Write a protein that binds this ligand. Structure first.
Ligand code: MN
Ligand code: MN
Ligand code: MN
Ligand code: MN
Ligand code: MN
Ligand code: MN
Ligand code: MN
Ligand code: MN
Lengths: 385, 385, 385, 385
């Protein structure tokens, strides 16, 4: 279960570089040099890294400081052949963004947010990012009066439309991926799920330019089925990127290493991604627990990729197993793929077998055989076949 | 706080009619005659009633039995002047639907589900329904292998497309409203939130024919902000109908009377509906707790309407209060309503005041004054102003 | 992973015998004869069965009907050598119990609840039950005014004290196990967690007679760590019995087969039970999903026991692995077992190494190595060592 | 609704003093001088303030630095007549506590934690604290192997026993209050609910010295009914102190001002505290949202107290209302207060009216009238009576 760069595993600078500050705790680790992160992740078999602007270039950097940070980073990338498939803006950390970036009540803040984003889009393109992620962590409210959500959605559309106009004007190929999260740090965050983000995108001027960057933990913070959400994103053609981590149901965003939290959900996710032929980065947005030293950081990072590869093997064996294939037939997964009424409305209306002469009781009596199928899945996950 | 018909309060037959069977409990109340329900609801100042097919006509009724049930119901409606603004299909109760209606793995069940729906659409239109609701309560899974969600969404789209074709073919004015729910009775339900439903609708052949019927409790079962969800639905022009009730956060679907559960959320919902000039039914999908006799049923129903009317008064008083108008200005709600960059992309890019010359620290230092605003809101809700 | 009776796997009649009625659904399976359940479970390698009074003897049975039901049951038990280690009362299904048994507001209902319980205690003793379970599913409220909880706890203590007096008076060896659940079917249930039940027991007249019967799904309905709860129960000497099943975090009580839901929690539970040398029944309180026919029922039941046995093997291999043993030392699990201050208060106060001369920074710099340990645990669970 | 000192409203230094650092955000406010906090809180009509050691004296202060901080604080207290009814230790912020204080795997950390606590107990007593709170925020785990919970509870008991020995040895009157929290910042925290804490206390050497300090938000993070929890604490005689704030169900710890979050729960809490004649501090552990400037801080703090006083008025009016007294009788709350079987076990056994001759159907038919009662409660809360 050794990762190779062809596996397209990527990590945010901010993941292995998390110093372990939480709402009740000071840092437990010194800052990481992005250069060290690039080299160490390469050694572990990573494909690439990602960054917020402010991960790579300290906020408030001079142009000359900015140049030096980027130069050193590119030297590390060039030396190792590591890629930068995705980049994003920090519109959450600085107190200016305390009521949001794109949907800050203060108009001057909204304009600044856009300029900050646009600057980093340029850098992303220079570094070869195919996807530009937007997580609106500060977009929302703790109280009802604070935020008119219709107005906020107007501002959010305006922002994303302007970003679309910008990339088009520049002839960039980069696409946008909106990252939903239901809450935290805001009491409620706008576009709280994959669903809300997908719906919003349809109302943008150039919807083709926007998809989703769903995160395992985020959907699970709403107690939602992450594989189901990813399925709908795939169905919409909108899975531009994905964030992989672990979460123990409905609490604060834990950002455990992938495979931790809901193990079975991780299995069904990997099954879906591989079955669907998702070709995007397998990106880990995770935090090595602050209990850990740097040995633990790199162990946790390695664990992300290991767990993906184990689950990939087990999902593949599941699908390849003739006993499972028969179980799928027994459960009529194959019938689910048949059109309901390719014969058309009139044919359906005129079909006595579909109502008048439908034996509801015979149909009802048919077991779905789902439990046998699921225990085959369990056996395969646990290598108990 | 006396309800009158022009308040547009409506109830499902299945609400006041709930006999109090739960997963651990037998009925605590005898079945209600729909005729009595109509009469009692009329006396309480209800505008209308709604029904599943199987609430009005017992499943498997003969034509003569069906005619007699509909005859008696129509007489009650005519006697009282009660309206039927909405109806729906029961695609969840009968064992045949144990793996779904429209997305049953069994093709013959999918076809039956459609025929059952179409039959009731005709009756709904006869009785004057402007909205036809679909709650796909059995669409989903308890286990990962049981349901291919991409295939399921293909079948779901086919079903809704066919229903659209049908209403078009008949020259009906009735529109569909998809009712999301995250879980229960399936382990996970497809289209689990307002977001997922809105997204799905955009992929239908005739999206204009479909909106959402969000339920307070359902969004809150995912820990989501219901007012925020309703805001997004309104933003999308897709709030065709709404289900009002109470829920205490993330647990089984409680269907408490409206005002119970999250009282603050109820306030902000009514504020939004009234502000936005929602003109649809105020429909209660609730269950009088099984502790109650019939006196308690009618008390609970009266409570739904009473609570709406109190909250309406308090929300209106909030928005009218000069002190609140000043607080909203202090919190820059007015700035939120102004376009971020009506001067356009190029002007934004060239605006040094938006970046190089933006005083981030001065902006960050401005308090949002949200707490003062919210306490004004609290004072108004509690009548302590 | 073949179960043997020595494994002490037990099932409620109501588990495999669940006909699949849920709050939105009619039965999907015919009723099971307890006699068939005994014989089929025996064939699958079960140790025993359990029952509510009303599972074995239909409510309202004549004495002669009661005698015939029990006679047939005992013939099946005697034929197979199947045991009845636990029994319980149904104080939830009948509408009389709509506001509770022991803490019904109606005093006459409370007295009836006790008499119903006492009758079944006698039967339990006849059948050789070592544990008598009480799940107060109807003890609680949907509204604040309905239930004075101090009064309710007075009534609950009175009831349990009377039950203690009864078993003592009869010289029975049977002990009581209180089963917590946070909600459902009541909006909130009294003694909602293992903690609340443990605390309550300490205030009973004869606390030695009472322990807990924790259920996986129930604790997880409060988003709690079930293994942690079981640890505290073990610490208190109060794990008389346990209910094993699966649950996907915070929603309605799913009662999935054991191993389903939170797989990693199941692993850590089995690790703890085996490590602690828990000698009580491994009891499954689960429901074969209503999607299933009887083939699926028995497959689901078999899966309960299979999953326990796989997890038992993996937990044992984890603990036996010298690499894991070293990881545990690296993480100072062994230091956790050392008394903090066996040298006593004065010694601690006078110990400069404990404050004045404690190098906080050196201590802080020590990594806990928890991530390496946890990935060893993951490898072992998945058989990827 | 003007607060005055005799209302016993108290605030942590860390509440109004919160600089607004969260897991995704830098400070939005400058540090507050405790002297200013004391003065401002006094002007708002606060009774008292509380502190962690490290709120009052910066970690690692010299004796001269410590004396100067305490000197200035004492002067503020003396100037204003503000009391210090409670204090506590910070065993969570410093990296040394990253795996806990009392249940750190590292023995030397456990000993340090105790010495740090004991130092502050002395200061607490000097300043007139009647209660010493312990929130073990770092006691727990993110992973299953990291913490043996039985061993941890052994260490936790040792720690609390030693603290009991200390206060006894010094002849202090101060009592301990353990503050439960289910999670955050640990993945799971030991003693996660009021229940678990109550249970644990019963196993201490001197249980009379220990109660609970429950927090609204903490119980609600497990989706529990806070009033119910407080009722059980009162029942046990263990409500030594209470933390008041707001929380929106199952998510990160929000620490909204009291009255925000679950408003209904706030009502029923105040009703209970006042009815039970709780005489302890009404302490607010809250954070003014980081959106706010200092004007917003003091508004938020004022809101805490205002909301308590409104709810107090409404609860008193509810209980005083003859209509409510009648509704409570109709719902048999008076019957709940009567012993079930003061006639004793034998009399109960011999009472045919309790079984053979009990009319179950007549009992079942009696409505509980809970909905009428609750709507009276709603009317009173909203001032609509
Ligand atoms: Mn996250
Ligand atoms: Mn992410
Ligand atoms: Mn509902
Ligand atoms: Mn509904
Ligand atoms: Mn259960
Ligand atoms: Mn159970
Ligand atoms: Mn808190
Ligand atoms: Mn607190």
């Amino acid at each position: 279960y050794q990762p190779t760069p062809e596996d397209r595993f990527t990590f945010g600078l901010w993941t292995v570089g998390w110093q372990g500050r939480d709402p009740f705790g000071d840092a437990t680790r010194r800052a990481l040099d992005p250069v060290e992160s690039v080299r160490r992740l390469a050694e572990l078999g990573a494909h690439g890294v990602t960054f917020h602007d402010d991960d790579l270039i300290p906020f408030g950097s001079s142009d000359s400081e900015r140049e030096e940070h980027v130069k050193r980073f590119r030297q590390a990338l060039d030396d190792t052949g590591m890629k930068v498939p995705m980049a994003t803006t920090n519109l959450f950390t600085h107190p200016v963004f305390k009521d949001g970036g794109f949907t800050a009540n203060d108009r001057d803040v909204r304009r600044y947010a856009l300029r900050k984003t646009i600057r980093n889009i340029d850098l992303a393109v220079e570094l070869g990012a195919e996807t530009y992620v937007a997580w609106g962590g500060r977009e929302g409210a703790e109280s009802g009066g604070a935020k008119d959500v219709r107005d906020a959605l107007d501002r959010m559309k305006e922002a994303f439309d302007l970003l679309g106009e910008y990339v088009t004007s520049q002839g960039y190929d980069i696409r946008f991926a909106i990252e939903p999260k239901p809450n935290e740090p805001r009491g409620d965050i706008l576009l709280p799920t994959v669903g809300h983000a997908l719906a919003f995108i349809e109302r943008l001027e150039r919807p083709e330019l926007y998809g989703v960057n769903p995160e395992v933990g985020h959907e699970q913070m709403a107690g939602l089925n992450f594989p189901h959400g990813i399925a709908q994103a795939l169905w919409a053609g909108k899975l531009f990127h994905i964030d992989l981590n672990g979460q123990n149901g409905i609490k604060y965003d834990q950002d455990l290493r992938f495979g931790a939290g809901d193990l079975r959900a991780a299995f069904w996710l990997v099954d879906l991604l591989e079955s669907a032929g998702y070709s995007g980065p397998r990106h880990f947005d995770f935090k090595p627990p602050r209990t850990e030293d740097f040995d633990g950081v790199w162990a946790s990072a390695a664990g992300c990729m290991r767990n993906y590869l184990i689950l990939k093997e087990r999902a593949a064996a599941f699908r390849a197993d003739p006993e499972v294939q028969e179980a799928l037939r027994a459960s009529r997964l194959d019938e689910l793929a048949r059109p309901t009424a390719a014969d058309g409305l009139q044919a359906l209306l005129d079909d006595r077998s579909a109502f008048e002469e439908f034996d509801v009781d015979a149909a009802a009596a048919r077991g779905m055989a789902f439990e046998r199928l699921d225990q085959l899945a369990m056996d395969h996950l646990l290598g108990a076949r």
